Tab-separated table of C-alpha atoms in Angstrom:
chain	number	residue	atom	x	y	z
A	1	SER	CA	-227.043	47.995	14.972
A	2	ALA	CA	-223.745	48.099	16.945
A	3	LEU	CA	-222.221	45.731	14.317
A	4	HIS	CA	-223.828	45.297	10.872
A	5	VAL	CA	-222.039	43.069	8.344
A	6	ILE	CA	-223.240	42.544	4.788
A	7	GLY	CA	-221.960	39.952	2.365
A	8	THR	CA	-222.908	37.216	-0.075
A	9	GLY	CA	-222.800	33.674	1.267
A	10	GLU	CA	-220.053	33.605	3.904
A	11	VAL	CA	-220.674	36.954	5.611
A	12	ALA	CA	-218.441	36.429	8.641
A	13	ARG	CA	-216.135	33.722	9.924
A	14	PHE	CA	-215.095	33.276	13.557
A	15	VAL	CA	-212.126	30.919	13.925
A	16	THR	CA	-211.128	29.264	17.227
A	17	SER	CA	-207.774	27.599	18.134
A	18	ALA	CA	-209.423	26.021	21.254
A	19	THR	CA	-213.161	26.001	22.217
A	20	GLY	CA	-214.945	29.175	21.114
A	21	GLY	CA	-216.390	31.004	18.181
A	22	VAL	CA	-219.424	33.077	19.067
A	23	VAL	CA	-220.413	33.875	22.665
A	24	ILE	CA	-223.804	35.530	23.133
A	25	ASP	CA	-224.031	36.994	26.630
A	26	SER	CA	-226.387	39.269	28.561
A	27	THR	CA	-225.808	41.844	31.293
A	28	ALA	CA	-228.449	40.439	33.675
A	29	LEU	CA	-230.136	37.130	34.410
A	30	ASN	CA	-233.432	38.571	33.189
A	31	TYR	CA	-232.120	39.432	29.700
A	32	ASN	CA	-232.182	36.563	27.196
A	33	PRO	CA	-229.180	35.999	24.895
A	34	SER	CA	-230.515	34.970	21.490
A	35	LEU	CA	-229.506	33.817	18.021
A	36	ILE	CA	-232.243	35.096	15.694
A	37	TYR	CA	-232.823	33.997	12.089
A	38	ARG	CA	-234.646	36.402	9.777
A	39	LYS	CA	-235.544	36.568	6.103
A	40	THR	CA	-235.929	40.077	4.679
A	41	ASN	CA	-235.491	41.227	8.298
A	42	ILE	CA	-238.604	39.379	9.515
A	43	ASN	CA	-238.230	36.875	12.358
A	44	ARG	CA	-238.462	33.211	11.405
A	45	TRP	CA	-236.716	31.268	14.206
A	46	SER	CA	-234.591	31.879	17.255
A	47	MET	CA	-232.550	29.810	19.698
A	48	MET	CA	-232.212	31.546	23.047
A	49	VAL	CA	-231.605	31.064	26.737
A	50	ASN	CA	-234.900	32.073	28.322
A	51	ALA	CA	-235.772	34.041	31.441
A	52	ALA	CA	-237.148	31.202	33.587
A	53	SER	CA	-236.094	32.163	37.088
A	54	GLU	CA	-232.702	30.872	38.258
A	55	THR	CA	-234.023	29.450	41.530
A	56	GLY	CA	-231.013	27.329	42.492
A	57	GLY	CA	-229.967	23.790	41.736
A	58	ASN	CA	-229.201	24.728	38.106
A	59	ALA	CA	-232.850	25.604	37.430
A	60	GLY	CA	-233.957	28.363	35.094
A	61	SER	CA	-232.290	29.854	32.021
A	62	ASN	CA	-233.541	27.001	29.848
A	63	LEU	CA	-232.774	26.634	26.160
A	64	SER	CA	-235.703	27.412	23.839
A	65	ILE	CA	-236.166	27.300	20.090
A	66	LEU	CA	-238.921	29.721	19.038
A	67	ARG	CA	-240.798	29.772	15.755
A	68	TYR	CA	-242.340	32.939	14.269
A	69	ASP	CA	-245.140	33.520	11.802
A	70	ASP	CA	-244.858	35.092	8.353
A	71	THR	CA	-245.215	38.574	9.922
A	72	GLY	CA	-242.547	37.848	12.552
A	73	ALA	CA	-244.824	37.320	15.571
A	74	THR	CA	-244.048	34.512	18.007
A	75	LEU	CA	-245.827	31.210	17.539
A	76	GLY	CA	-244.202	29.847	20.710
A	77	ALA	CA	-241.334	27.624	21.800
A	78	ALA	CA	-241.219	24.491	19.664
A	79	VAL	CA	-238.441	23.056	21.891
A	80	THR	CA	-237.564	23.728	25.533
A	81	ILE	CA	-234.587	21.961	27.164
A	82	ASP	CA	-234.493	22.349	30.937
A	83	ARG	CA	-231.068	23.190	32.339
A	84	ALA	CA	-231.476	21.533	35.720
A	85	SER	CA	-232.451	18.115	34.346
A	86	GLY	CA	-231.557	18.114	30.668
A	87	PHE	CA	-235.144	17.109	29.919
A	88	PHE	CA	-236.062	17.719	26.259
A	89	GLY	CA	-239.526	19.179	25.661
A	90	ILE	CA	-241.199	19.151	22.266
A	91	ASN	CA	-244.294	21.384	22.187
A	92	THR	CA	-243.945	21.194	25.999
A	93	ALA	CA	-242.968	24.244	28.017
A	94	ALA	CA	-242.412	22.242	31.243
A	95	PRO	CA	-240.813	18.898	30.317
A	96	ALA	CA	-241.082	16.238	33.004
A	97	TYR	CA	-239.375	13.306	31.275
A	98	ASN	CA	-236.027	12.974	29.494
A	99	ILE	CA	-238.029	13.342	26.274
A	100	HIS	CA	-241.503	14.887	26.694
A	101	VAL	CA	-243.839	15.415	23.728
A	102	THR	CA	-247.252	17.082	23.789
A	103	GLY	CA	-249.285	15.833	20.834
A	104	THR	CA	-248.754	12.948	18.425
A	105	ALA	CA	-245.750	10.721	17.753
A	106	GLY	CA	-244.841	8.956	14.529
A	107	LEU	CA	-242.177	6.304	13.956
A	108	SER	CA	-241.598	4.791	10.546
A	109	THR	CA	-240.418	1.367	11.802
A	110	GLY	CA	-243.006	0.390	14.441
A	111	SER	CA	-245.175	1.397	17.375
A	112	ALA	CA	-242.726	0.784	20.243
A	113	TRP	CA	-239.322	1.908	21.377
A	114	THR	CA	-236.611	-0.718	21.324
A	115	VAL	CA	-235.352	-1.345	24.858
A	116	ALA	CA	-231.815	0.015	24.607
B	1	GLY	CA	-205.081	42.632	20.232
B	2	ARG	CA	-208.762	43.298	20.933
B	3	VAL	CA	-211.492	45.188	19.142
B	4	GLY	CA	-214.392	46.584	21.126
B	5	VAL	CA	-217.558	47.976	19.590
B	6	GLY	CA	-219.389	49.980	22.230
B	7	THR	CA	-216.826	49.019	24.912
B	8	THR	CA	-213.540	50.705	25.688
B	9	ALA	CA	-212.601	47.516	27.593
B	10	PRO	CA	-212.854	44.543	25.227
B	11	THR	CA	-212.011	41.123	26.611
B	12	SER	CA	-211.896	38.945	23.446
B	13	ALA	CA	-210.572	39.370	19.920
B	14	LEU	CA	-213.946	40.956	19.114
B	15	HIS	CA	-216.296	42.226	21.835
B	16	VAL	CA	-219.551	43.968	20.846
B	17	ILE	CA	-222.038	45.476	23.307
B	18	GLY	CA	-225.508	46.740	22.421
B	19	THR	CA	-229.140	46.724	23.484
B	20	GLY	CA	-231.326	44.212	21.706
B	21	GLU	CA	-229.912	43.737	18.198
B	22	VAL	CA	-226.218	43.718	19.018
B	23	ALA	CA	-224.970	42.384	15.683
B	24	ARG	CA	-226.714	41.680	12.345
B	25	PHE	CA	-225.105	39.579	9.573
B	26	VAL	CA	-226.973	39.931	6.280
B	27	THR	CA	-226.460	37.601	3.336
B	28	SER	CA	-227.532	38.210	-0.278
B	29	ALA	CA	-227.456	34.483	-1.017
B	30	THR	CA	-228.001	31.395	1.071
B	31	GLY	CA	-225.291	31.559	3.716
B	32	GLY	CA	-224.606	33.486	6.889
B	33	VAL	CA	-222.099	33.094	9.713
B	34	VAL	CA	-219.323	30.480	9.938
B	35	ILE	CA	-217.764	29.212	13.172
B	36	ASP	CA	-214.562	27.398	12.266
B	37	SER	CA	-211.452	25.962	13.889
B	38	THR	CA	-207.789	25.868	12.978
B	39	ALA	CA	-207.465	22.109	13.563
B	40	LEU	CA	-209.656	19.045	13.760
B	41	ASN	CA	-209.119	18.728	17.544
B	42	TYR	CA	-210.445	22.274	18.232
B	43	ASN	CA	-214.173	22.774	18.747
B	44	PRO	CA	-216.164	25.509	17.010
B	45	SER	CA	-218.817	26.585	19.484
B	46	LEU	CA	-221.814	28.819	19.945
B	47	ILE	CA	-221.840	29.618	23.682
B	48	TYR	CA	-224.691	31.314	25.558
B	49	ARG	CA	-223.923	33.114	28.812
B	50	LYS	CA	-225.798	35.226	31.317
B	51	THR	CA	-223.745	37.768	33.247
B	52	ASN	CA	-220.758	36.126	31.508
B	53	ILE	CA	-221.409	32.692	33.076
B	54	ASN	CA	-221.909	29.717	30.769
B	55	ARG	CA	-225.470	28.368	30.507
B	56	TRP	CA	-225.709	26.467	27.166
B	57	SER	CA	-223.533	25.736	24.121
B	58	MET	CA	-223.965	24.088	20.734
B	59	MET	CA	-220.686	22.873	19.394
B	60	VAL	CA	-218.907	20.381	17.158
B	61	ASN	CA	-216.941	18.028	19.401
B	62	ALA	CA	-213.464	16.567	19.011
B	63	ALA	CA	-214.437	12.920	18.483
B	64	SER	CA	-211.704	11.752	16.148
B	65	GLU	CA	-212.282	11.809	12.367
B	66	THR	CA	-211.173	8.264	11.626
B	67	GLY	CA	-212.780	7.997	8.186
B	68	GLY	CA	-216.219	7.402	6.785
B	69	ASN	CA	-217.621	10.571	8.389
B	70	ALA	CA	-216.783	9.445	11.933
B	71	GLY	CA	-216.034	12.100	14.519
B	72	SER	CA	-216.863	15.779	14.885
B	73	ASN	CA	-220.373	15.152	16.256
B	74	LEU	CA	-222.796	17.900	17.409
B	75	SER	CA	-223.479	18.386	21.063
B	76	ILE	CA	-225.762	20.719	22.987
B	77	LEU	CA	-224.220	21.165	26.420
B	78	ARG	CA	-225.829	22.544	29.560
B	79	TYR	CA	-223.859	24.259	32.334
B	80	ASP	CA	-224.389	24.587	36.068
B	81	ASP	CA	-224.944	27.771	38.033
B	82	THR	CA	-221.169	28.297	38.356
B	83	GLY	CA	-220.599	27.817	34.625
B	84	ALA	CA	-219.195	24.261	34.718
B	85	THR	CA	-220.410	21.668	32.231
B	86	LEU	CA	-223.268	19.410	33.323
B	87	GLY	CA	-222.982	17.296	30.183
B	88	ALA	CA	-224.465	16.934	26.730
B	89	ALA	CA	-228.238	17.206	26.697
B	90	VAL	CA	-228.178	16.280	22.997
B	91	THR	CA	-225.566	14.497	20.857
B	92	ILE	CA	-226.098	14.014	17.108
B	93	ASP	CA	-223.820	11.543	15.344
B	94	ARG	CA	-222.463	12.952	12.072
B	95	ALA	CA	-221.908	9.664	10.222
B	96	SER	CA	-225.361	8.211	10.960
B	97	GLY	CA	-227.485	11.244	11.878
B	98	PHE	CA	-228.633	9.404	15.008
B	99	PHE	CA	-230.129	11.758	17.590
B	100	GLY	CA	-229.212	11.154	21.244
B	101	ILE	CA	-231.009	12.679	24.216
B	102	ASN	CA	-228.870	12.289	27.328
B	103	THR	CA	-226.968	9.694	25.268
B	104	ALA	CA	-223.337	10.283	24.287
B	105	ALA	CA	-223.248	7.459	21.711
B	106	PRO	CA	-226.684	7.152	20.090
B	107	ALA	CA	-227.350	3.813	18.423
B	108	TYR	CA	-230.882	4.455	17.068
B	109	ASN	CA	-232.308	7.251	14.951
B	110	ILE	CA	-233.693	8.564	18.253
B	111	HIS	CA	-231.985	7.266	21.380
B	112	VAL	CA	-233.066	8.425	24.837
B	113	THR	CA	-231.404	7.524	28.132
B	114	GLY	CA	-234.038	7.968	30.814
B	115	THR	CA	-237.799	8.401	30.688
B	116	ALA	CA	-240.180	9.335	27.879
B	117	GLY	CA	-243.551	11.049	28.174
B	118	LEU	CA	-246.227	11.458	25.506
B	119	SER	CA	-249.460	13.327	26.173
B	120	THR	CA	-251.671	11.268	23.849
B	121	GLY	CA	-250.747	7.646	24.618
B	122	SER	CA	-248.047	5.080	25.237
B	123	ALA	CA	-247.365	3.988	21.631
B	124	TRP	CA	-245.882	5.640	18.588
B	125	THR	CA	-248.115	5.777	15.525
B	126	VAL	CA	-246.561	3.807	12.674
B	127	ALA	CA	-245.658	6.515	10.136
C	1	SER	CA	-215.357	37.003	4.113
C	2	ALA	CA	-216.450	40.600	4.949
C	3	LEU	CA	-215.474	39.929	8.621
C	4	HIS	CA	-212.890	37.333	9.719
C	5	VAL	CA	-211.976	36.953	13.392
C	6	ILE	CA	-209.402	34.568	14.853
C	7	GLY	CA	-208.737	34.143	18.582
C	8	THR	CA	-207.615	31.908	21.375
C	9	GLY	CA	-210.610	31.364	23.632
C	10	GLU	CA	-214.067	32.924	23.048
C	11	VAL	CA	-212.968	34.646	19.712
C	12	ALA	CA	-216.071	36.950	19.590
C	13	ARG	CA	-218.477	37.980	22.375
C	14	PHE	CA	-221.774	39.790	21.745
C	15	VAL	CA	-223.326	41.235	24.891
C	16	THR	CA	-226.929	42.393	25.082
C	17	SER	CA	-228.339	44.712	27.793
C	18	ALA	CA	-231.856	43.601	26.929
C	19	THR	CA	-233.278	40.437	25.500
C	20	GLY	CA	-231.718	40.076	22.057
C	21	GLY	CA	-228.330	39.161	20.605
C	22	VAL	CA	-227.062	38.110	17.149
C	23	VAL	CA	-229.211	38.239	13.987
C	24	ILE	CA	-228.535	36.212	10.816
C	25	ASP	CA	-230.668	37.724	8.054
C	26	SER	CA	-231.084	37.443	4.268
C	27	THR	CA	-232.121	39.824	1.524
C	28	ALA	CA	-234.801	37.559	-0.003
C	29	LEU	CA	-237.243	34.844	1.026
C	30	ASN	CA	-235.325	32.317	-1.111
C	31	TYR	CA	-231.928	33.149	0.490
C	32	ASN	CA	-231.575	30.890	3.565
C	33	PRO	CA	-229.812	32.386	6.705
C	34	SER	CA	-227.417	29.828	8.202
C	35	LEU	CA	-225.018	29.196	11.121
C	36	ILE	CA	-222.334	26.920	9.636
C	37	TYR	CA	-219.841	24.966	11.737
C	38	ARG	CA	-216.575	24.054	10.034
C	39	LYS	CA	-213.326	22.440	11.015
C	40	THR	CA	-210.260	23.551	9.043
C	41	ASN	CA	-212.775	25.426	6.883
C	42	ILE	CA	-214.693	22.276	5.828
C	43	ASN	CA	-218.444	22.022	6.570
C	44	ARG	CA	-219.407	19.707	9.408
C	45	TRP	CA	-222.819	20.883	10.715
C	46	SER	CA	-225.205	23.755	10.229
C	47	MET	CA	-228.364	25.176	11.779
C	48	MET	CA	-230.297	27.106	9.142
C	49	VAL	CA	-233.699	28.199	7.920
C	50	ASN	CA	-234.460	25.895	5.014
C	51	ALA	CA	-235.564	26.234	1.405
C	52	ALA	CA	-239.193	25.139	1.849
C	53	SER	CA	-241.142	27.821	-0.012
C	54	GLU	CA	-243.252	30.356	1.903
C	55	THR	CA	-246.551	29.646	0.172
C	56	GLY	CA	-248.708	31.280	2.872
C	57	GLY	CA	-250.138	30.403	6.258
C	58	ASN	CA	-246.632	30.096	7.796
C	59	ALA	CA	-245.582	27.351	5.341
C	60	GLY	CA	-241.914	27.081	4.458
C	61	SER	CA	-238.717	28.325	6.036
C	62	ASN	CA	-238.442	25.436	8.471
C	63	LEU	CA	-235.514	25.071	10.885
C	64	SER	CA	-232.913	22.475	9.970
C	65	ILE	CA	-229.839	20.968	11.519
C	66	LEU	CA	-227.762	19.571	8.621
C	67	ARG	CA	-224.789	17.154	8.877
C	68	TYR	CA	-222.012	17.200	6.232
C	69	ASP	CA	-219.493	14.533	5.167
C	70	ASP	CA	-215.730	14.726	5.604
C	71	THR	CA	-215.392	16.622	2.284
C	72	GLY	CA	-218.062	19.120	3.322
C	73	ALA	CA	-220.908	17.790	1.157
C	74	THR	CA	-224.414	17.587	2.593
C	75	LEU	CA	-225.253	14.224	4.189
C	76	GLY	CA	-228.740	14.985	5.448
C	77	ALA	CA	-231.031	16.987	7.686
C	78	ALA	CA	-230.734	15.375	11.101
C	79	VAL	CA	-233.486	17.608	12.499
C	80	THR	CA	-236.197	19.648	10.843
C	81	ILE	CA	-238.764	21.680	12.799
C	82	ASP	CA	-241.868	22.760	10.890
C	83	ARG	CA	-242.593	26.466	11.338
C	84	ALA	CA	-246.353	26.344	10.701
C	85	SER	CA	-247.039	23.460	13.128
C	86	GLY	CA	-244.020	23.195	15.443
C	87	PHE	CA	-243.736	19.492	14.548
C	88	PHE	CA	-240.259	18.067	15.273
C	89	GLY	CA	-238.712	15.780	12.635
C	90	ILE	CA	-235.726	13.514	13.181
C	91	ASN	CA	-234.342	12.301	9.884
C	92	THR	CA	-237.647	13.664	8.413
C	93	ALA	CA	-237.736	16.987	6.497
C	94	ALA	CA	-241.566	17.134	6.499
C	95	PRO	CA	-242.654	15.930	9.946
C	96	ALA	CA	-246.339	15.053	10.193
C	97	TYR	CA	-246.552	14.354	13.951
C	98	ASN	CA	-245.443	16.428	16.952
C	99	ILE	CA	-242.417	14.118	16.976
C	100	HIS	CA	-241.750	12.243	13.746
C	101	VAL	CA	-238.815	9.836	13.435
C	102	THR	CA	-237.726	8.091	10.234
C	103	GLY	CA	-235.800	5.030	11.374
C	104	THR	CA	-235.293	3.275	14.696
C	105	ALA	CA	-236.000	4.347	18.283
C	106	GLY	CA	-234.286	3.235	21.469
C	107	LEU	CA	-235.212	3.975	25.072
C	108	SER	CA	-233.044	2.829	27.965
C	109	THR	CA	-235.875	2.320	30.451
C	110	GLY	CA	-238.525	0.455	28.447
C	111	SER	CA	-240.518	0.020	25.270
C	112	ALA	CA	-243.378	2.466	25.901
C	113	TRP	CA	-243.885	6.157	26.354
C	114	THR	CA	-245.345	7.096	29.731
C	115	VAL	CA	-248.740	8.744	29.235
C	116	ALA	CA	-248.077	12.314	30.329
């Protein structure tokens, strides 16, 4: 690639004296900046800002964590956080509550939330 | 100075431009990339931008390290259309591991400020 | 450290002209690619693909957010996302529900999930 670093353990270190470290940017709103984790150069997970249309009011460009199968093919977004609302979706592409889960929910201490 | 890779006009200490796989860091043991800071009050950050405007960041904050693993908590921040912070969508407390959603100071293993939706029912299953 | 960058501000910017960005890769299935956050070069947090073995059917290599103590020693996995199922664990390295929490749960608005 443009930059290819090889090492053992600590491959690269980016040191900030303020707020910074690694910026991942794209040249257009339709291109998704991504941090991609691979093993033996096969996709396993990524965290990226997706291409959901930026329609105003801070909508679009939501944060997604994608999982990939053993061959590197997408299995979908396990987490989607919407930028306009902050709503946190688990197995839910369109979260509609501050936490929104599609499927089952397990809690080791009881069946209810504590009113905080 | 500044080092550009693919740009003759770099704007940070290192500035790399590519198409698709811009940079690949390969480790021959468990490991990878480190984001570090020169002092405890400086915040190592992973920042995502589009067209060089902030959108999201995952960073270690400057909550003070007062002992017993206090301070330096993780936060996932969202940013508005102009690139200004909208706040921490997620805050994870380092000392306790408590996971806050829209909650700056989580006090439960999961702590949500706002609403909660579950497709299958209104109760958690006791695990 | 093969590459060591220090800056005021952003430190390092990686710009993609298509969907893509930064790849953290390993040379073997048992070498875990990691993004490690340090202060003064002491571990504080990481996001990494974990050591669960890839035994087939997308098992193993789950995504973890780890928290470290003030000396840099591992304190725990705050979050683990299962690759084969997408299940989201909080304080649970082997989640068995779409959201699985070990410990307590607090909700500011009430005791129940809304049925979505």
